[PDB]
């Protein structure tokens, strides 16, 4: 097996999600089905899916195009809020593990109020007082530190409580903050927003209290260039600092498009992967709505291929992933007729790479991933899922497992693909078609016979029999192994009343009779073998039938005319033997008949055959 522990667990989860859609059940939450395995690994992966769920848990317009949802200002706004809610809660967990040694340890004693937690967080991260703080303290801590880390944790209420106990010190900041907490989308009114920004810009552009600076332009979304590096030293603190500063419809203003493009264009992977920590960059792209970038990026880490494919599937089963129309493009690209700030993922290629790894010895699991390509076609029109099953069968040669083994008793035990579509007639011909083009007739027959395509089964069975008609049928020979399959196809084609056009069909049952004629001839059962050839009315034995038999030879399958030479000789040698054992006249007359027939028929080795036939007739007299 080519699948690692983690990859295998995901496969099982994707089998469920397929079993549900294959039986018409409720469309379960894919993101939940993937996070179910994440908990079996380190929390590096669990915290990823947590971000994936929260970033995709946005009210969408079902049955709407992918590009439309992702271009709409409506959806683009909720992404920023879902991310900020993740950066705030994520930071809140950092503040817990900073005070208590373990999340469990914090829980048993009870998570304290965000206010008392933050206070018990300031104790550690600033034990001694910084001399540059302003506006005094509140219950033993600087008022601005409490406000910042409370807003950072996302509890505006806890921050407003701090403000209520410092009404005299904070001046007019109270009426401004109380408006920020009330107004939605973390934005103030243009009039009041103007009043505070100008005040900050007036004489507080450079204040000795960094926490004061941070809060002001987090509330006013100002000084976008100043990264407030004094308080936002971590990467998440930067993302959170900026997403609280982005704006929507000219100076000192930043928008999501600029920010998202500004980040990866100027500070690409190189900047965010110098510490050899891959998820750091992924979180930067995913929490900025650049899902295709983050997916391709994370898909290149050979250790995190599994995770990047699935986060792509989630975005794909939620009409959020922007697929690349052309299949000839690179993995990541920007369509020419699209804005430059969005990118597109060649989803078809993405799955095709992941599959090649475990498609060789783990076919069942491969199909589960090929199903997501059911909705796509290629330039030639083939259904992508169907084509992927053809290529996977041509390579793996797993016919019984994937296509269903058709035993020699008339049964068709369904295969693994039967689960996904009930119309399995084309691919069985596709797989049968190539194997036919590769001279693998004995297989192409079994495959065509699996799809009950007797036109092709009998055609190929005619080719495999004609060479072996006069041969000696011996144990385990190529004659027995082909005759016995032909008879197993004769019964199942009569018991089920199946037949190809009379040309193909007539020749097929005719060869089977001839194969019996030589099997009796090679055994010495001369009398019995003579009777068979007489029924077939293939070789004339009375002079009257020569005219009609000669005309029939003209339109009989060349697989029959080929073996005419051996038939005449065996029949002659049959009469020849019976002569040495009135009757003499009758054999003599029949001997003549064979000669005149052979004389009027142009066929294989007519030279040596016509001569031998005449000699055997002379010895009779």
């Amino acid at each position: 097996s080519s699948l690692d522990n983690i990859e295998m667990a995901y496969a099982r989860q994707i089998y469920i999600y397929n079993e549900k859609i294959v039986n018409g059940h409720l469309q379960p939450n894919l993101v939940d089905l993937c996070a179910s395995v994440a908990e079996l690994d380190d929390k590096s992966i669990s915290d990823m899916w947590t971000m994936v769920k929260q970033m995709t848990d946005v009210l969408l317009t079902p049955a709407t195009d992918a590009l439309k949802n992702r271009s709409s200002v409506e959806v683009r706004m909720e992404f920023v809020r879902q991310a900020l809610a993740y950066l705030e809660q994520s930071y809140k967990n950092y503040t817990l593990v900073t005070v208590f040694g373990n999340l469990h340890q914090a829980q048993l004693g009870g998570v304290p109020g965000t206010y008392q937690l933050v206070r018990s967080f300031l104790n550690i991260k600033l034990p001694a007082p910084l001399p540059g703080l302003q506006d005094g303290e509140v219950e033993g801590h600087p008022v601005w530190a409490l406000i910042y880390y409370c807003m950072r944790c996302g509890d505006l209420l806890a921050a407003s409580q701090v403000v209520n106990r410092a009404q005299h010190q904070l001046g007019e900041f109270k009426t401004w903050f109380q408006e920020y907490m009330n107004s939605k989308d973390r934005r103030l009114s243009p009039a009041t927003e103007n009043k505070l920004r100008l005040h900050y810009r007036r004489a507080l552009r450079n204040n000795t209290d960094p926490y004061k600076r941070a809060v002001y332009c987090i509330i006013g979304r100002c000084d976008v260039t100043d990264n407030q590096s004094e308080v936002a030293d971590k990467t998440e603190d930067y993302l959170w600092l900026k997403l609280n500063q982005v704006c929507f419809d000219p100076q000192d203003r930043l928008t999501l498009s600029q920010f998202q493009k500004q980040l990866l264009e100027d500070y690409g992977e190189s900047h965010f992967t110098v510490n050899q920590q891959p998820f750091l960059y992924f979180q930067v792209l995913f929490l900025t709505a650049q899902f295709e970038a983050a997916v391709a990026f994370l898909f290149r880490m050979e250790r995190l291929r599994c995770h990047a494919v699935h986060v792509a599937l989630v975005l794909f089963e939620l009409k959020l992933l922007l697929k690349s129309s052309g299949q000839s493009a690179q993995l990541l690209s920007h369509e020419p007729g699209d804005p430059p700030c969005l990118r597109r993922l060649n989803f078809v290629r993405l799955l095709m790479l992941y599959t090649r790894k475990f498609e060789s010895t783990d076919p069942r699991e491969a199909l589960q991933y090929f199903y997501f390509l059911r909705d796509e076609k290629d330039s030639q029109g083939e259904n992508m899922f169907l084509r992927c099953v053809s290529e996977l069968v041509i390579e793996s040669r797993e016919f019984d497992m994937i296509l269903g083994k058709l035993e020699n008793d008339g049964s068709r035990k369904p295969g693994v693909i039967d689960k996904f579509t009930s119309d399995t007639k084309p691919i069985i011909n596709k797989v049968a078609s190539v194997a036919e083009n590769k001279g693998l007739f004995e297989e192409a027959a079994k495959l065509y016979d699996l799809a009950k395509n007797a036109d092709k089964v009998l055609e190929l069975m005619n080719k495999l029999l004609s060479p072996v008609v006069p041969q000696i049928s011996a144990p385990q020979s190529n004659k027995e192994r082909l005759k016995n399959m032909a008879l197993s196809i004769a019964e199942r084609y009569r018991a089920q009343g199946i037949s190809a056009n009379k040309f193909v069909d007539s020749t097929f049952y005719l060869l089977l009779d001839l194969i019996t004629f030589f099997d009796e001839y090679h055994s010495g059962h001369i009398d019995r073998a003579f009777d068979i050839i007489e029924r077939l009315k293939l070789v004339p034995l009375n002079q009257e039938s020569v005219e009609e038999r000669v005309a029939a030879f003209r339109n009989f399958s060349d697989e029959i005319r080929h073996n005419l030479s051996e038939v005449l000789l065996a029949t002659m040698n049959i009469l020849f033997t019976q002569f040495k054992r009135d009757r003499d006249s009758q054999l003599r007359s029949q001997a003549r008949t064979l000669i005149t027939f052979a004389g009027m028929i142009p066929y294989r080795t007519s030279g040596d055959t016509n001569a031998r036939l005449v000699q055997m007739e002379v010895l009779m007299n």
Partner: protein, 255 residues
């Protein structure tokens, strides 16, 4: 023989490449037949499945019967102990690690070397990467040889573009480029060699000294082969500025 395992397949393939390189074209028809059987091998230079817990708990729970692909084998208290040991030293999956040990029992190399069964798995694992990577150098080396037929010189060229670099030929045609896989490939060799000295030095601070020396030799040879393959790929103008910046940074961070 005809039914050769992974190790015997790479060892036999290597001999064929040397023939064509030493002016011996008596195995042209036999050479092409091997590239098609090992197509999945040339795609990924070196990749070890991460150690999964599903197989760890399942292997030791019912160490009675093992099923790998189409064949079946029986596990005993002695063989099962070698699987966990090999998987721990190399951090390899239990399923993949077991297949390596099974190949030793069949070939019966324990008597040819007279070493523990679990140690042979380490050598057999390193041999695969050696020939798997060393054989690639011969393909590109022969594809650039000017003292051979122009037709044959071009056959190995287009083949390397698709088998090694994963670039389809001109008559046809989500996936990752070759360089990023090669850079990550060489990275694994460094991390594996670094952790080797740390763990080896701890216990050293035995009958496996020569085996450790041979493993270090194989690792340095594989690194040299990967470097030569990267140089050859760069010689075809298949790079960019990002790879150059990454290499410059790696050099600046040289210790």
């Amino acid at each position: 023989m005809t039914d050769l395992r992974k190790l015997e397949a790479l060892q036999a393939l290597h001999a064929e490449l040397v023939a064509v390189r030493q002016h011996r074209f008596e195995g042209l028809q036999v050479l092409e037949t091997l590239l098609e059987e090992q197509t999945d091998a040339f795609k990924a230079l070196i990749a070890k499945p991460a150690r999964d817990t599903k197989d760890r708990e399942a292997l030791g729970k019912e160490p009675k019967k093992l099923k790998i692909g189409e064949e079946e084998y029986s596990l005993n208290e002695d063989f099962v102990n070698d699987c966990l040991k090999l998987a721990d030293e190399l951090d390899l999956n239990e399923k993949e690690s077991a297949r390596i040990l099974i190949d030793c029992d069949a070939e019966g190399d324990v008597e040819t070397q007279s070493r523990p069964l679990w140690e042979c798995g380490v050598i057999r694992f390193h041999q695969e990467r050696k020939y798997l990577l060393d054989c690639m150098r011969l393909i590109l080396e022969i594809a650039a040889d000017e003292d051979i037929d122009a037709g044959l010189q071009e056959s190995f060229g287009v083949a390397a573009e698709d088998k090694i670099f994963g670039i389809p030929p001109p008559w046809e045609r989500q996936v990752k480029k070759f360089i990023p896989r090669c850079m990550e490939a060489m990275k694994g060799v460094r991390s594996m060699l670094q952790c080797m000295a740390d763990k080896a030095n701890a216990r050293n601070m035995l009958d496996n000294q020569e085996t450790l020396d041979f493993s270090r030799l194989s690792l340095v040879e594989q690194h040299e082969c990967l470097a030569s393959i990267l140089h050859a790929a760069v010689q075809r103008h298949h790079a960019t500025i990002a790879d150059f910046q990454d290499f410059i940074k790696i050099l600046r961070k040289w210790d």
